[PDB]
Amino acid sequence: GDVEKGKKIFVQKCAQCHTVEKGGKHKTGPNLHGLFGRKTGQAPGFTYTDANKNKGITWKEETLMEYLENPKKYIPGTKMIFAGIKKKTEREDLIAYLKKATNE
Ligand code: HEC
Numbered sequence: 001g002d003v004e005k006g007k008k009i010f011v012q013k014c015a016q017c018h019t020v021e022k023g024g025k026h027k028t029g030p031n032l033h034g035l036f037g038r039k040t041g042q043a044p045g046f047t048y049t050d051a052n053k054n055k056g057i058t059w060k061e062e063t064l065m066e067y068l069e070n071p072k073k074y075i076p077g078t079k080m081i082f083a084g085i086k087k088k089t090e091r092e093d094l095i096a097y098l099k100k101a102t103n104e
Contacts, residue, residue, distance in 0.1 A: 001089050003104075006097025009090045013082070020101070029080065034102040035059040051077025061095050068094060 007021065015021050017028035024031045030043035037060060041053030055075045057063050066074045069091060071083060085091055 001093050001096065003093075003096050003100050005090070006093035006095070007101075009085070009093060010097055013085065014094075017082075032098060032101060035064070036061070036099055036102045038102075049077045049079050051075065061099065064098065065091070065095065 010018075011021055014029075017026075018030060018032055019025040019027055020031040020033070024033075026043060026046040030046045030048065033042055037058075039056060039058055041056070052075055057067075057075060063074075067078075069084060071078045071080045085094065
């Protein structure tokens with residue numbers, strides 16, 4: 001749907017671990033550092049599991065769609081204790097938000 005819907009639901013279910021949106025930080029997932037077009041294996045010392053970075057899958061709409069719907073299927077060894085959002089429109093709105101969040 002919208003950018004707004006994505007940042008607001010991110011700040012509810014995601015900033016809870018990935019505190020990118022204010023004071024860029026990483027409590028139990030990395031800061032989403034400029035993701036759309038970039039690689040994994042990039043957090044400043046946030047010591048996550050080997051297999052994510054090692055799989056190298058490149059972050060974009062497709063790969064973050066397959067990932068945030070189905071993470072441990074899409075890339076093995078992901079420790080993301082959440083596995084899915086709720087509404088497929090929050091899923092849209094996250095793509096709409098994170099498409100912007102590396103430029104706006
Ligand atoms: C804390 C328990 C988390 C919650 C809630 C969410 N995420 Fe997560 N995420 C978590 C872990 C442990 C990791 C590290 C890497 C791994 O695969 O284990 C991640 C990773 C991501 C990524 C990819 C980062 C990268 O590899 O560069 C993204 C894009 C991501 N998570 C997004 C995200 C969103 C949008 C969330 C709200 C629905 C969310 N995560 C919740 C842990 C946690």
